[PDB]
Amino acid sequence: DQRREMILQAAMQIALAEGFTAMTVRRIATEAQTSTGQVHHHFSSASHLKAEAFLKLMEQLDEIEQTLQTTSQFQRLFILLGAENIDRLQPYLRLWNEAELLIEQDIEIQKAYNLAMQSWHQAIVQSIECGQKEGEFKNRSNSTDIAWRLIAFVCGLEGIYKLGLQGLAEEDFKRHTEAIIRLELL
Amino acid sequence: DQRREMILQAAMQIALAEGFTAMTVRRIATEAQTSTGQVHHHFSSASHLKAEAFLKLMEQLDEIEQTLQTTSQFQRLFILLGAENIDRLQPYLRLWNEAELLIEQDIEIQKAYNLAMQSWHQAIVQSIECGQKEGEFKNRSNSTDIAWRLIAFVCGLEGIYKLGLQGLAEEDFKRHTEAIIRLELL
C-alpha cells in the first residue's frame, strides 16, 4: 500500500535524475531498499512501472505549475504551453521529451504518453474556458479547437528547432507563442 | 552530362515508387541500364545520390504545385501547406515523411532535408509577400515570422495526428489550417 507508493517514489527519483534506461527493477529495488521480488509483486512489468512513474511525475509537474502565481489566464497559458522556461521543470521536460521517443518501442509508455497529452489538452481547455468566463478571452472559436491548435503550434515549433535550421533562433519561442495566443484569444 | 541526369532520373523513379531503402546503386544501375562503375563515377556516395534525387523530386513537387490554377494567395497557401490533399502528390509526401526519419542516421539526407525546409519557407514567404503586395493579405507581422509559424503549425498538427489520440479527427486538418491562415493574414 504505502510500500508500493515508496517503490513508485524511488522509480520517480531515478526517472527525473537519470531517465528511463536507468530504471531497471534491480536499480529501483536498491534505491527503495526493498527486494526485486516485491517490485515485481506490485507492478505487472518494468514498463508498467516506468509508465506509472512517468504519469506521477507529470501530475507533479502540473502541481508545481499551479503554485506559480498568476492574475490572468494569459499568464497561465504561457506556463502551460512551456513558454516560461522554469529551471525547476527542466528535468520533467527532459523526461517528457524522452518519453516521446519511447512511444514507438514501449507499449506502456505509448499509452501513458497519450494520457498525458490528453491531460495537457484538458488543462489548456480549462484555462481557455476560465479566461472566457472571466471576460479576459474572446469566444472566436470553441475552446477544444483552440487548445489542440495551441498544442500543435508549440509542438511543431519545438520540432522545427530540433532540425538545426539556419537563420532560426530558438530564443523567439516565447514571442511566437504570445503572437498565436493573442490571435486566437485576444 | 545527360547520362548523369539519366542515372538521377532512374533513382528518382525508384524513390517515388519504393522509397530510399530500395535505392541501392545496383538497383539504380539496372534501372538506368548503366554500370555500377558509372554510378559511382557520377556520385560521391549512395547517400549523395539519394539526397540529390530527393531534392530533385521536391523541386518537381514545387513545379507540379505551381500548375494548379489559383486566383488568390489564400488558395496558394493551402496548397503550399498541404491542406489540399492532391492524390498526385501522395508519393512525394510519403517520400518527404520518409526523409524526415532518415535525418538522424544519414548525413546527406540530413542536409538535404533542411535545404528543402528552407525552400518551403521561402515559397511561403513569397506567397505572403505577393498577397500583401496585391492587397489581399494584411501586414500584421512580418512575412518571415508568419511563414515559420505556419510551417510550425502544420508540422505540429501532423505530429499530433501521428499519436493516435482519442477524440481527434485527422479530417479537421484543412479547417484548422484555414483558421490559422485567416488569423495571421486576413
- Does residue B121 share a domain with residue B74? yes
- Does residue B26 share a domain with residue B98? no
- Does residue A103 share a domain with residue A68? yes
Number of CB atoms found within 10 A of residue A104's CB: 9
Domain that holds residue B92: 46-185
Cα dihedral sign for A83, B170, B131, B182?
A: negative
Q: What is the DSSP string of A66-88?
A: HHS--SSHHHHHHHHTT-S--TT
- Does residue B91 share a domain with residue B121? yes
- Does residue A37 share a domain with residue A1? yes
- Does residue A68 share a domain with residue A135? yes
Q: Which distant-in-sequence residues (6+ apart) come within 8 Å of A143 by Cβ?
A: A125, A128, A129, A132
- Does residue A26 share a domain with residue A73? no
- Does residue B50 share a domain with residue B17? no
- Does residue A52 share a domain with residue A6? no
B183 chain-A contacts, CB cut-off 8 A? 183-184
Provide the shortest C-alpha distance from residue B101 to chain A (in Å): 12
CATH of the domain at A38: 1.10.10.60
User: Are the C-beta atoms of A138 and A59 separated by less than 8 Å?
Assistant: no
Tell me how far apart the alpha carbons of residues B3 and B23 are, in angstroms, rounded to a whole number: 18
- Please give the grid coordinates belonging to residue B72: 488568390
Tell me how far apart the alpha carbons of residues B170 and B157 are, in angstroms, rounded to a whole number: 9
A138 chain-B contacts, CB cut-off 8 A? none
CB contact under 8 A, B183 and A184: yes
- Does residue B14 share a domain with residue B98? no
End-to-end CA distance of chain A: give it in Å, rounded: 48
CB contact under 8 A, B118 and A165: yes
- Does residue A80 share a domain with residue A66? yes
The chain B residue lying nearest A141, using CA atoms, is B179
- The residue whose grid cell reads 539526397 is B51
- Please give the grid coordinates belonging to residue B106: 544519414
Residue B162 CB burial class (10 angstroms; 0-12, 13-18, ≥19)? exposed
The experimental technique behind this entry is X-ray
B114 chain-A contacts, CB cut-off 8 A? 163-166
Tell me how far apart the alpha carbons of residues A89 and A95 are, in angstroms, rounded to a whole number: 10
